[PDB]
Write an enzyme that holds these catalytic residues in place. Structure first.
Site, PDB file in Angstrom:
ATOM      1  N   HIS A 167      38.000   6.083  -8.850  1.00  0.00           N
ATOM      2  CA  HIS A 167      36.762   5.413  -8.704  1.00  0.00           C
ATOM      3  C   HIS A 167      35.878   5.390 -10.191  1.00  0.00           C
ATOM      4  O   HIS A 167      34.869   4.883 -10.121  1.00  0.00           O
ATOM      5  CB  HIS A 167      35.923   6.108  -7.745  1.00  0.00           C
ATOM      6  CG  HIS A 167      35.343   7.583  -8.075  1.00  0.00           C
ATOM      7  ND1 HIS A 167      35.897   8.517  -7.166  1.00  0.00           N
ATOM      8  CD2 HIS A 167      34.743   7.917  -9.119  1.00  0.00           C
ATOM      9  CE1 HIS A 167      35.233   9.571  -7.790  1.00  0.00           C
ATOM     10  NE2 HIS A 167      34.684   9.477  -8.791  1.00  0.00           N
ATOM     11  N   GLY A 186      28.863  13.546 -12.557  1.00  0.00           N
ATOM     12  CA  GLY A 186      29.901  13.532 -13.902  1.00  0.00           C
ATOM     13  C   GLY A 186      30.940  14.378 -13.920  1.00  0.00           C
ATOM     14  O   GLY A 186      31.545  14.560 -14.646  1.00  0.00           O
ATOM     15  N   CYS A 222      33.143  14.516 -11.750  1.00  0.00           N
ATOM     16  CA  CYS A 222      34.550  14.054 -11.130  1.00  0.00           C
ATOM     17  C   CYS A 222      35.591  14.128 -11.990  1.00  0.00           C
ATOM     18  O   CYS A 222      35.374  14.176 -13.323  1.00  0.00           O
ATOM     19  CB  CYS A 222      34.277  12.539 -10.495  1.00  0.00           C
ATOM     20  SG  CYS A 222      32.932  12.474  -9.348  1.00  0.00           S
TER      21      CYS A 222
HETATM   22  C1  LIG Z   1      32.047   5.554  -9.356  1.00  0.00           C
HETATM   23  N1  LIG Z   1      30.695   6.295  -9.233  1.00  0.00           N
HETATM   24  C2  LIG Z   1      29.503   5.506  -9.910  1.00  0.00           C
HETATM   25  C3  LIG Z   1      30.622   7.051  -8.222  1.00  0.00           C
HETATM   26  C4  LIG Z   1      29.394   7.500  -7.808  1.00  0.00           C
HETATM   27  C5  LIG Z   1      29.124   8.492  -6.839  1.00  0.00           C
HETATM   28  C6  LIG Z   1      30.016   8.767  -6.209  1.00  0.00           C
HETATM   29  N2  LIG Z   1      29.965   9.924  -5.147  1.00  0.00           N
HETATM   30  C7  LIG Z   1      29.243   9.512  -3.863  1.00  0.00           C
HETATM   31  C8  LIG Z   1      30.611   9.490  -2.999  1.00  0.00           C
HETATM   32  C9  LIG Z   1      31.726   8.649  -2.909  1.00  0.00           C
HETATM   33  C10 LIG Z   1      32.302   8.821  -1.586  1.00  0.00           C
HETATM   34  N3  LIG Z   1      31.729   9.600  -1.130  1.00  0.00           N
HETATM   35  N4  LIG Z   1      30.467   9.732  -1.577  1.00  0.00           N
HETATM   36  C11 LIG Z   1      30.081  11.211  -5.293  1.00  0.00           C
HETATM   37  O1  LIG Z   1      29.858  11.974  -4.345  1.00  0.00           O
HETATM   38  C12 LIG Z   1      30.598  11.740  -6.535  1.00  0.00           C
HETATM   39  N5  LIG Z   1      30.119  13.112  -6.986  1.00  0.00           N
HETATM   40  N6  LIG Z   1      31.213  14.046  -6.756  1.00  0.00           N
HETATM   41  N7  LIG Z   1      30.497  15.316  -6.894  1.00  0.00           N
HETATM   42  C13 LIG Z   1      29.068  14.988  -7.045  1.00  0.00           C
HETATM   43  C14 LIG Z   1      28.269  16.054  -6.998  1.00  0.00           C
HETATM   44  C15 LIG Z   1      26.945  15.532  -7.017  1.00  0.00           C
HETATM   45  C16 LIG Z   1      26.694  14.155  -7.200  1.00  0.00           C
HETATM   46  C17 LIG Z   1      27.609  13.230  -7.174  1.00  0.00           C
HETATM   47  C18 LIG Z   1      28.963  13.658  -6.995  1.00  0.00           C
HETATM   48  C19 LIG Z   1      31.429   8.456  -6.600  1.00  0.00           C
HETATM   49  C20 LIG Z   1      31.562   7.625  -7.626  1.00  0.00           C
END
Ligand SMILES: CN(C)c1ccc(N(Cc2ccn[nH]2)C(=O)Cn2nnc3ccccc32)cc1
Ligand SMILES: CN(C)c1ccc(N(Cc2ccn[nH]2)C(=O)Cn2nnc3ccccc32)cc1
Lengths: 304, 304
Positions: free
Chosen positions: A41, A143, A145
Site C-alpha cells: 500500500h 507512518g 506501516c
Molecule cells: C497508503 N495510505 C495512504 C494508507 C492510509 C491509511 C491506511 N490505514 C487504513 C486502512 C487500510 C486498511 N484498513 N484500514 C491504516 O490503518 C494505516 N495505519 N496503520 N496503522 C495505523 C495507526 C494509526 C493510523 C493509521 C494506521 C493504510 C494506508
C-alpha cells in the site's frame, strides 16, 4: 528475580530500517541483503485504500518512483516486484548491517518484539503476541506501516510480522515477510471486524509458573483438575482449550517448580472462578497471556 | 492508536556493552570512548560482599587483573580508578560504536529503558521507573550487574542507571554513571529494606490522558476537585502529593484532550475510592504509574 514484559534487543533490526516513499506516501521498509521489503500500500493514496487494485496501481510505477533512503543516503532501486501484500524493491547495494535472518510465519499465541518506526527511524520497542483472532494489540500511529515484528535466537533474527493497518476497533493487522496477512484481513479500508479475542491459556500458565519462580505464590491452592475439567472452565471464560501439546510444552516449568501442570491448571481455574480479590500477580491485577513458556524459561535463565 | 510499555531502541547501547572479569567475578561494563564503567563490586568475591573494604580490596588489583572483552576481542587496560561505587577502566582503544552521550542523575518518578545483559551480551530491553523509594522493579539475574538504564533524545543517549544489587525483598538498587547510588543503598550484602513504594501520581494522570487519547473513557466523570482535596485522597492511598509543577507538566495533555487537570484528578480520586469494578484501562486492571507525561506525548506523537 523480577519479571518484566521484555523485548529482544533491537539493534540488529534498527540497522535494517529504511524509509520508502512512493508519490506522496511514506512508510518504513526492511532492508536485508539487496532487497527492501515494504507494504504494497506504499503505492496508494488514502483515496485508493477504499478499493485498491494493486496490480493496476503498480503498472503506473517504475523503479525510479520508489524512493528509498537509509539514514541520510539514497538507495538506487534496480527492480521491483509484488509478492502477496508486500513489495520487494531490489536495490544496487547490499545492506552492510544485514544480520543473519529468517522469515517465519508464527502461530497465534506466539510472542515477538516490534520495532515501531516512523520515516525509517526507530521510535520504540515493545513485546506483544499474535492474538488467537490474528490481530496484534500494538502501539502504531500513521507512518508506522512497514515496522516489523521479530524474534532473536543468539545471532539470528527471525522476522515474523510487518505492520499494515489498524482496524476501526483500534487493533492491528499485518503480514508475515512473504506478504501474507495473518488472519482474514485484507489491505483495504473496509468493514473488517476481528473475531473473539480469547486468552492464550498456555501463556497464562507459563506466567503463573514465572510468578512462583519469582516469589508470588498466594494463588497456589490444594486442588488439582483434569484437562477436560479445566477445559470446561476455560470455555466459559473465553480461554483457548489446553491440549496435551501445551501440557508437554509446560513440562520444563513444571519440573523447575515441582508444581504439576494440572495442579497449576486448578490454581488458574480458581482464579477464573473467584477472581483476584484485589490482589496482584507479578505486578498485574489481571491474568497475563503475552509470555510464552519459552519466554518464561529464557527470562528466568538469562539467555543472551 | 494503542498504548504500550515501550522501551527506547537499544542499538546505541548494545554497541557499548562489554564483559568485565576480575578474578572469579564476571559482570557487564559500559564502554564509552576509552573508558569502561562497571560496578566496583567486580573486585569482590561473594564472601567479600558481606563486609567489603573497597579501597583495601582495590590495592591488590592491577590493570592486568581487569579482563575486558568486547565481543570476542580483548581490550587492553591501561589505567583504573574508583569513582564512588563504579570503576573506570581506561582502555587503549576508543569504542568505535560510542554514541553521543550524557550521564544524568534522574529523579524518582522518571522512567528509563534497561538493557539487561549477561557476559557483556544483551538479553532484553524493558521500560521501568525510578520508584519514590529509589528502588527499581526490574528483571535481573546473577551476572546482570553493570547492565544500564538510559533515555534517548534523537541521537543522544542519556545514561542514568547502572545495576548493582537485588535487595532481599526482590527489588533492585543501583547507581548513576558517576557511581552514586540512588537512595540510601550501599553495595554491601546487609539488611537494607526499602521505604514505602508510593504511586507516582503525575504518571497515573499522564496514563489516564493516554487512555482518553486511545479511546478508553469510561472512567471520566462529572466531577472536579482541588489540589488540596485530591492530595488528602492521594495521602490515604500512598500516592505522591500532586504539586502545581505536576499540573503544569500535564498542561500539554490537558490541552490535547480538553480535560482540565483537576477534572482528571477527580476521575482518579473516584477510581481510588471505588476501584475499577472489574473493568480495565489500556489493558490494565490497575492504575499504571510507569509512564511520564513526556512518555505519553512522545508515544502519542511518534518521536523518533
Ligand atoms: C497508503 N495510505 C495512504 C494508507 C492510509 C491509511 C491506511 N490505514 C487504513 C486502512 C487500510 C486498511 N484498513 N484500514 C491504516 O490503518 C494505516 N495505519 N496503520 N496503522 C495505523 C495507526 C494509526 C493510523 C493509521 C494506521 C493504510 C494506508
Ligand atoms: C561480586 N559478587 C560476587 C556479588 C555477588 C552478589 C551480589 N548481590 C548481593 C548483594 C550485594 C549487596 N546487597 N546484595 C547482588 O544482589 C547482585 N545481583 N544483582 N542483581 C541480582 C539478581 C539476582 C541475583 C543476584 C543479583 C553482588 C555482588
Amino acid at each position: 528475580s523480577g519479571f518484566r514484559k521484555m523485548a529482544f534487543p533491537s539493534g540488529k533490526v534498527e540497522g535494517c530500517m529504511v524509509q520508502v516513499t512512493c508519490g506522496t506516501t511514506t512508510l518504513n521498509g526492511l532492508w536485508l541483503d539487496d532487497v527492501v521489503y515494504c507494504p504494497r500500500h506504499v503505492i496508494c493514496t488514502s483515496e485508493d485504500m477504499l478499493n485498491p487494485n494493486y496490480e493496476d496501481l503498480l503498472i503506473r510505477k517504475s523503479n525510479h518512483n520508489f524512493l528509498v533512503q537509509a539514514g541520510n543516503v539514497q538507495l538506487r532501486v534496480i527492480g521491483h516486484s509484488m509478492q502477496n501484500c508486500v513489495l520487494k524493491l531490489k536495490v544496487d547495494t547490499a545492506n552492510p548491517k544485514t544480520p543473519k535472518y529468517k522469515f517465519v510465519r508464527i502461530q497465534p499465541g506466539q510472542t515477538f518484539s516490534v520495532l515501531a518506526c516512523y520515516n525509517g527511524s526507530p521510535s520504540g520497542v515493545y513485546q506483544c503476541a499474535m492474538r488467537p483472532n490474528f490481530t496484534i494489540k500494538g502501539s502504531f500511529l500513521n507512518g508506522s506501516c512497514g515496522s516489523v515484528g521479530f524474534n532473536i535466537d543468539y545471532d539470528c533474527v527471525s522476522f515474523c510480522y510487518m505492520h499494515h493497518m489498524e482496524l476501526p476497533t483500534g487493533v492491528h493487522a499485518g503480514t508475515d515477510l512473504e506478504g501474507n496477512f495473518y488472519g482474514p484481513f485484507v489491505d483495504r479500508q473496509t468493514a473488517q471486524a476481528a473475531g473473539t479475542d480469547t486468552t492464550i491459556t498456555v501463556n497464562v500458565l507459563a506466567w503463573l509458573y514465572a510468578a512462583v519462580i519469582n516469589g508470588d505464590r498466594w494463588f497456589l491452592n490444594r486442588f488439582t483438575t483434569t484437562l477436560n475439567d479445566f477445559n470446561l472452565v476455560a470455555m466459559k471464560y473465553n480461554y483457548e482449550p489446553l491440549t496435551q501439546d501445551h501440557v508437554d510444552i509446560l513440562g520444563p516449568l513444571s519440573a523447575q517448580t515441582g508444581i504439576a501442570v494440572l495442579d497449576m491448571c486448578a490454581s488458574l481455574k480458581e482464579l477464573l472462578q473467584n477472581g483476584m480479590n484485589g490482589r496482584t500477580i507479578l505486578g498485574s491485577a489481571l491474568l497475563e497471556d503475552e509470555f510464552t513458556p519459552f519466554d518464561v524459561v529464557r527470562q528466568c535463565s538469562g539467555v543472551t
